[PDB]
A paper describes a structure:
[name] ([name]), a kinesin-6 family motor, is involved at several key stages of cell division, and in particular is essential for cytokinesis in mammals. Kinesin-6s are particularly intriguing in this context because they are up to ~40% larger than the canonical Kin1 motor domain due to a number of unique loop insertions. To address the deficit in molecular understanding of the [name] mechanism, we have determined cryo-EM reconstructions and calculated atomic models of MT-bound [name] in different nucleotide states.
The properties of [name]-MD are such that an MT-bound [name]-MD-ADP structure could be captured, in which density corresponding to ADP is coordinated primarily via the P-loop with some connectivity to Switch II/loop11. A portion of loop11 is visible near the P-loop and the N-terminus of helix-α6, while most is not visible. However, in MT-bound [name]-MD-ADP, loop9 as well as the N-terminus of helix-α4 are more flexible compared to these other kinesin-ADP conformations, reflecting distinct properties of [name]-MD. With ADP bound, as for other kinesins, the C-terminal helix-α6 lies close to the motor-MT interface and terminates adjacent to the C-terminus of helix-α4 (arrow). The density for helix-α6 is less well-defined, with a length of three helical turns at most and is thus shorter than typically seen in other kinesins. In this configuration, extension of helix-α6, docking of the neck-linker and formation of the cover-neck bundle (CNB) are all prevented. Strong density corresponding to only a few residues of each of the N- and C-termini is observed, although additional density alongside β-sheet1 is visible suggesting partial occupancy of neck-linker conformers directed towards the MT minus end (dotted line). Our ability to determine an ADP-bound structure highlights the tighter association of this motor with MTs throughout its ATPase cycle and is consistent with the biochemical data. Given these properties, it is thus not clear what state our ADP-bound reconstruction corresponds to in terms of intermediates in the [name] ATPase cycle. It could for example be the [name]-MD-ADP complex as it binds the MT from solution, or could represent a MT-bound NN structure captured after ADP binding.
Numbering used by the authors:
A (entry chain B): 2 to 44, 47 to 360, 369 to 437
B (entry chain C): 61 to 100, 115 to 190, 297 to 320, 326 to 366, 378 to 390, 398 to 409, 426 to 450, 455 to 503
C (entry chain A): 2 to 34, 61 to 439
Write the structure that this text describes.
Amino acid sequence: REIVHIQAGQCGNQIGAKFWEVISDEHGIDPTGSYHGDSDLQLERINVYYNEAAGNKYVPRAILVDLEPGTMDSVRSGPFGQIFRPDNFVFGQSGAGNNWAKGHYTEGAELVDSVLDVVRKESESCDCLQGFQLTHSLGGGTGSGMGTLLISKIREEYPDRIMNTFSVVPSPKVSDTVVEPYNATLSVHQLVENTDETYCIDNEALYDICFRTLKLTTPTYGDLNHLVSATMSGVTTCLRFPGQLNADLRKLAVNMVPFPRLHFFMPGFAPLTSRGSQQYRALTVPELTQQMFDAKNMMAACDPRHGRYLTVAAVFRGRMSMKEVDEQMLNVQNKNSSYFVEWIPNNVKTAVCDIPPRGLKMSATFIGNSTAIQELFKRISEQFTAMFRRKAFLHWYTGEGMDEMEFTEAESNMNDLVSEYQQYQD
Amino acid sequence: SEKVKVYLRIRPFLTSELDRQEDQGCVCIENTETLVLQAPQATHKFTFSQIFGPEVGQVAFFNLTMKEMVKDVLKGQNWLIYTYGVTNSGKTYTIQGTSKDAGILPQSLALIFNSLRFSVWISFFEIYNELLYDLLEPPSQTLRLCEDQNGNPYVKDLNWIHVRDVEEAWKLLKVGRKNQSRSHSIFSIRILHLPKISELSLCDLAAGNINTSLHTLGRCIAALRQNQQNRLIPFRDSKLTRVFQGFFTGRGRSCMIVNVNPCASTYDETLHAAKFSALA
Amino acid sequence: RECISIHVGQAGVQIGNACWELYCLEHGIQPDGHVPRAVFVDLEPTVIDEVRTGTYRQLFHPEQLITGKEDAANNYARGHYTIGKEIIDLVLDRIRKLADQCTGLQGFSVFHSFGGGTGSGFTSLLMERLSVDYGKKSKLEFSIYPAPQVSTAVVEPYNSILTTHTTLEHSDCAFMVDNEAIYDICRRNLDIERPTYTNLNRLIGQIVSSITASLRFDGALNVDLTEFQTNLVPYPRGHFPLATYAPVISAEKAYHEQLSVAEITNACFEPANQMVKCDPRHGKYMACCLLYRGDVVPKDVNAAIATIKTKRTIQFVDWCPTGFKVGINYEPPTVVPGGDLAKVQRAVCMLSNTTAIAEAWARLDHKFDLMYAKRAFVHWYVGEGMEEGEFSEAREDMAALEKDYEEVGVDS
Ligand SMILES: CC(=O)O[C@H]1C(=O)[C@@]2(C)[C@H]([C@H](OC(=O)c3ccccc3)[C@]3(O)C[C@H](OC(=O)[C@H](O)[C@@H](NC(=O)c4ccccc4)c4ccccc4)C(C)=C1C3(C)C)[C@]1(OC(C)=O)CO[C@@H]1C[C@@H]2O
Ligand SMILES: Nc1nc2c(ncn2[C@@H]2O[C@H](COP(=O)(O)OP(=O)(O)OP(=O)(O)O)[C@@H](O)[C@H]2O)c(=O)[nH]1
Ligand SMILES: Nc1nc2c(ncn2[C@@H]2O[C@H](COP(=O)(O)OP(=O)(O)O)[C@@H](O)[C@H]2O)c(=O)[nH]1
Ligand SMILES: Nc1ncnc2c1ncn2[C@@H]1O[C@H](COP(=O)(O)OP(=O)(O)O)[C@@H](O)[C@H]1O
Ligand SMILES: [Mg+2]
Ligand SMILES: [Mg+2]
């Protein structure tokens, strides 16, 4: 039931750094410290994301793959940065250019060999291997390129293990890069044909959630990441704890992926109230449903209201009765029957853990698989095709070893993905 | 549209098989196109294009394909013949055949060269665990896939050799057949007419790729039949069908032969084989 | 005479823990006794580990606690084929060692959760081998039928249609409990919006206590397991009877403890107390086993049944003259020290087979058909050593269960 995290690229590393800051507190594990856990329930399944080596130094099982020293060199020189073993650091002093081809065909291809070695050392650790989780962004070289090539090999070495991926899709409103859509289109192609679970995170939706659902005036990267980190813990770690109704990657995927295509999900948080003021503690149960099932609160840019639902995964974590949970869940599917699919009687897959995230009393991780994600991929196709027509920065790709058909493959594939979702929307 | 021609072939009971039980004739025959299933119970109907009795050897069966194989060069498009059935039902017998009794494959090259400026290339590969292997030359794993700028997929790094002699063609494919003696076997030959180009593919059917491919095929034939009969295609889901897309989605004749045992114990197997091909 | 129990699946383990707790509680057996007579099987360590760490931890033996270090998977196929097959050996081994150790057994009490992984798959293959190795015994399974609208798993129906298809011709008596109807009962006949799984399971564990436990305890009208399979199923088909409890009153709000036979027996015929969403909308009774326990007078019983037999509102099937198996036990019911149960000095455990099951089945068959039409999560089953065959053959089978329950009744 163990897993190995992979933080490819600058973004992926930053995300991982914040993710490990959270998870550690959610298991009472200090950088060089051991199990300081306030409780004893955070020790029964630690193995899943840690490794027993010394006896006090529980090293997290993650991999840092990036071609920019500076980036990785800021992750290791910070707080929890000294928790990762040197062997886990897979850096490539080559050209960390923001080019997909440069990080997939030339500079990225060379470092692959140094990754495969580590991924095997981590897979053949102990117990049973569940899968590999990848964190990255579709707006960079090492992220969209290197991160997607690494997984392509993983899914060939271990076609049994599932592959959970957290991708920071290019935010619509404002792109953090110019080539962004190019790198995205190329990465999404391989992704949709490798991973078995993908959680789309959107920079513009993230900002929003930190500005309207959180009175935060200055939502920095750390903040944004912190929000996501809370979701991935409810996804992964959570399922590694006891509960009246527990689940796991397998149970989740076997109920979340209706079609081999892979299908993209959208992370949502339940208790999202501002600290001081907002602290009403109104989280009995329907308040969580109200939140999670609302447009605003969705980490993705697209809104659920713009597309039917295919799958719903409400992973609760806190002492509660299966009656107040199941009842509420059902009611929502009866009230909003309009967008909740017809060929599936009950899309919602209820899950209820026991131990909540340390300081919280009641929580619930939301995972939605709606066809609304069409209003995201469509954007990408548009952005891509619009600049592809003129072959904008094609010289940066072709010059680093690429093919004219590589773009057609990616575009076609991803464009077909948009279509597929629509085939079920109606 | 060109619906796959379904031909049903019933092989004679094996020495040990017949000795075990004289179940031969479990399937009843009504019309040349249809078969009725009556097993001592279950009653079903299998509708095909044509069927040959259990007494019919490979000789009588290959002749039907002969006319279809030689005509392909004239067609100017791709052609594919799929052999489906239970192991030992006669698939290999129908494809390559025995030394004494040649199958559909040997006769095809014999007739093609007989008519043979015409250029013909030969390719023989097997797919195992979604990986392609070149049966043609013994030294040797991944194979690669090439896609044209238009989006048309083609097999890359496949060993293609021109054949000057008729026996040479059969012998060259035999080399690969020797290797594989579980997986899918596919023999592809490109005919150049001077340019009118045809492609003859002899496919011997048989892991996650097998159960998937079988289902995807059933999904594609269903989706296709729907589109053809009345006012999404699963080809992308599976690489096997995707590479053959040009032939399927394009204008081309698709012949499918279903070989099975007339045995009553094999009835459960038989229904599945015939179900993959066609129903009523 | 004895009866081992096979609790499989996440839910099956939780329901087993609750039932087993109550069991020892009414037998004067604290955590440290003697040795029980059941086993727990699941594909998730944490599920079995909860009992290996929680209460009554040392009340069991590591030999009767089998777990599969791999993955559970919420799909029948995987739990049946892929993984399930691997574990069957070890599991069967235990159910054969305990069967020999005991002295003249009667059968095996199965406990599973229709719409699950190990609860669906595992059980299917387990009972398959059991009905062959121990065909000369009683095969009673206690299943937890997926709530009609309050589903858990998304694939839920798929897992229940495949488990019934393989168990229908292998089970003798399949008791079914509706999860949705349990929520309602705790809402109306207990009044509480905080009924956790451990509370729901306690209800079932009470009914089951009167099923197995009590039956093994002498009384004025002892009832064996054989008697059940004989009086409950008129046809080889593993017909699914319903579970009903009489004293389902709260030990805080309402206070009516002293509830004469006439009242407690009648409280079982109402759909608002049958632990099943199989309301008597048309389902005619064909066989009912009234299991009484506590201070009950045979004459009073033989009067409550009489008045009902002449009520007509409980319309029985035509071919059924008298379908009331009277079971009178001595041992009164047993309420948990700190639960929510009133505690009466008598209970009416009503179980029966009614055409009502045709409803529930219809709605579940519908689910299967609807989803199957678009294949949905079929690839998760297919890629686990499965195909359209077994699927379609399970659709056809269930169809003959819709016809069965329709032919066994509705007409004279
Ligand atoms: C006094 C008190 O009760 O403080 C709360 C608090 O005020 C609130 C506002 C917290 C607070 O969270 C944020 O302000 C926040 C900041 C950046 C991004 C996202 C959120 C809190 O910081 C977060 C913190 O969360 C946890 O402790 C969880 O275990 C959480 N942990 C982390 O995210 C984490 C933070 C720093 C270091 C390590 C871990 C978690 C959630 C899911 C899965 C695993 C862990 C909590 C309850 C609080 C504070 C401390 C103020 C809230 O968030 C969470 C994730 O619980 C924001 O809305 C909720 C409601 C809480 O009541
Ligand atoms: N009464 C009762 N029902 C339960 C309990 N636990 C789960 N269920 C129900 O049983 C079904 C859940 O099955 P799961 O827990 O998902 O799975 P499982 O059968 O244990 O096996 P896996 O799928 O392999 O994990 C749902 O319909 C739940 O409502 C319980 O403790 N009591
Ligand atoms: N949430 C989030 N996004 C980030 C972070 N860093 C970069 N990004 C996003 O990632 C994209 C840029 O890709 P980048 O990570 O620099 O690529 P790479 O470093 O070359 O692999 C932009 O869309 C950014 O908004 C981060 O720490 N958190
Ligand atoms: N129609 C037939 N007439 C005579 N022999 C046959 C016929 N079909 C099959 N056989 C023989 O029966 C055996 C099984 O045939 P084969 O084609 O190898 O089975 P499969 O390829 O389906 O596993 C072979 O020895 C083959 O020569
Ligand atoms: Mg053969
Ligand atoms: Mg379980």
